[PDB]
Amino acid sequence: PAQTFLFQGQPVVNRPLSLKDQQTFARSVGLKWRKVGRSLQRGCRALRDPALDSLAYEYEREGLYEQAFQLLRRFVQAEGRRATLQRLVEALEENELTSLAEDLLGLTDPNGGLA
Numbered sequence: 576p577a578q579t580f581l582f583q584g585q586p587v588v589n590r591p592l593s594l595k596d597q598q599t600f601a602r603s604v605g606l607k608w609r610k611v612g613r614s615l616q617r618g619c620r621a622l623r624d625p626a627l628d629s630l631a632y633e634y635e636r637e638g639l640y641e642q643a644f645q646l647l648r649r650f651v652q653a654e655g656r657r658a659t660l661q662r663l664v665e666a667l668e669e670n671e672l673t674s675l676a677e678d679l680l681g682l683t684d685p686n687g688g689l690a
């Protein structure tokens with residue numbers, strides 16, 4: 576993976592997903608975890624069908640927060656250090672979650688508008 580990438584025309588540092596990234600994602604995406612998973616399926620064989628249905632079977636009854644957290648756990652389990660901030664941010668941008676992407680990248684003004 577590259578050490579940097581371009582986001583919104585801005586250079587940002589890449590890294591493996593962090594615990595903080597996973598918590599922030601799980602706190603925010605809700606039902607959109609499935610659409611983000613669909614985006615991640617394209618570059619992650621281990622998330623291809625029926626893996627998202629398996630995740631739902633195992634965790635839907637534990638709630639929306641836990642399902643989203645477990646999506647990223649499976650991504651990291653499969654890809655290791657190649658499960659990067661860049662790949663997650665790209666999936667978020669595709670799925671109309673740019674504010675969340677900015678949060679992960681540290682670009683969000685903490686005292687800005689409510690998202």
Ligand SMILES: *[C@@H]1O[C@H](CO)[C@@H](O)[C@H](O)[C@H]1NC(C)=O
Pocket residue numbers: 609624627628631
């Ligand atoms: C993914 O798409 C397939 C085909 O429509 C569907 O059967 C499956 O339940 C979907 N998995 C989800 C939405 O988690």
